[PDB]
Amino acid sequence: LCSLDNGDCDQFCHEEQNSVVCSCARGYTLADNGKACIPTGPYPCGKQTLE
Amino acid sequence: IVGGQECKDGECPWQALLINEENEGFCGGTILSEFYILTAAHCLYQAKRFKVRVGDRNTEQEEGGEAVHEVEVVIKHNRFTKETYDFDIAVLRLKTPITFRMNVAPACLPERDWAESTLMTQKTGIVSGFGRTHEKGRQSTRLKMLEVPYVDRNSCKLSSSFIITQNMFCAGYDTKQEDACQGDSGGPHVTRFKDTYFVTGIVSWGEGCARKGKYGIYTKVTAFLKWIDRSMKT
Ligand SMILES: O=C1[C@@H](NS(=O)(=O)c2cc3ncccc3s2)CCN1Cc1cc2ccncc2[nH]1
Ligand SMILES: [Ca+2]
Missing domain, CATH: 2.40.10.10 (Trypsin-like serine proteases)
Structure with missing residues (x-):
């Protein structure tokens, strides 16, 4: 599960009730596909700055 | 390094620098958020008064993105022990929020x-x-x-x-x-x-x-x- 390619999650992966559930760091929102993490605003944590 | x-x-961008009264850096820090810096508790003993500079890459040419911040609170771990470096962690709350920009992000x-x-x-x-x-x-x-x-x-x-x-x-x-x-x-x-x-x-x-x-x-x-x-x- 989460041991297999991080469960397909962009960030946090937790194995609940024999299933994989993804989550994100503060400042991100779980995408509709429940895996990807979308930044809430500008300069989200953990991202190198480009502009 | x-x-x-x-x-x-x-x-x-998350790199922060703790600077002493003479503006020389003596320890580092990590930007956790607009108000908090994560540092080593053992650094709080390195200097009496100090501030946190962010957005710095060349201490020999004010590139513009630099920002010095005063420390409001110093939250050192209650269990830190000098003799062994155990529990070497401290969090700093800044008086003013860090404005994220190029070279300044958590x-x-x-x-x-x-x-x-x-x-x-x-x-x-x-x-x-x-x-x-x-x-x-x-x-x-x-x-x-x-x-x-x-x-x-x-x-x-x-x-x-x-x-x-x-x-x-x-x-x-x-x-x-x-x-x-x-x-x-x-x-x-x-x-x-x-x-x-x-x-x-x-x-x-x-x-x-x-x-x-x-x-x-x-x-x-x-x-x-x-x-x-x-x-x-x-
Ligand atoms: O050489 C050294 C160290 N002296 S010692 O080896 O006698 C040590 C004595 C000691 N006593 C208790 C716990 C750990 C140590 S290490 C102390 C700091 N420093 C300088 C020093 C700071 C630093 C930060 C990151 N990486 C390497 C680094 N070396
Ligand atoms: Ca500079």
Whole structure:
């Protein structure tokens, strides 16, 4: 599960009730596909700055 | 930082620097948020009065993005012990919020379990700072970054001459002349996962710098995640 390619999650992966559930760091929102993490605003944590 | 490369534009935005009354940096920090800086508790003994500078890459040319911030609160770990470097962690609340911009952005705080199984099992982490470039050299004028492999706990416990508590971990090389150093202390140790960097450690100490048979010891951030969360609300 989460041991297999991080469960397909962009960030946090937790194995609940024999299933994989993804989550994100503060400042991100779980995408509709429940895996990807979308930044809430500008300069989200953990991202190198480009502009 | 001994060896490694200098951080290029916007590559180490979470890097913060603790500067003394004479404006010289003496320790590092990691931007956790607009109000909080994660540093090493042992640095709070390095200077009486100090401030936090962010967005700096070349301490010899005001590039514009620099911002000096006064410290409002110093939240040191109640269990920090000077004699052994145990519980080497401290959080700083700034009087004024840091405005994120180019070269000024926070590192993500990970979740303990996920970080320890997925982040800390990665091949490498990234340590950075304005610390010395040689064991007996001068502090660096340019912000540097070094990819340091995670070191097996036992090979590391064995290599060390002092107790490696459960609050610290090892990273770096056995012989390769690459390693953090004095002045980099309190600085960030981040692990990259899918183009997003998570704070995984705080530069703590080491026997000299880049010495053979010796590694770099970091405070195990994952062991203080609950503590950091509580300190960033008080
Ligand atoms: O050489 C050194 C160290 N001296 S010692 O080896 O006698 C040590 C004595 C000691 N006593 C108790 C716990 C750990 C140590 S290490 C202390 C700091 N420093 C300078 C130093 C700071 C630093 C930060 C990151 N990486 C390497 C680094 N070396
Ligand atoms: Ca500068």
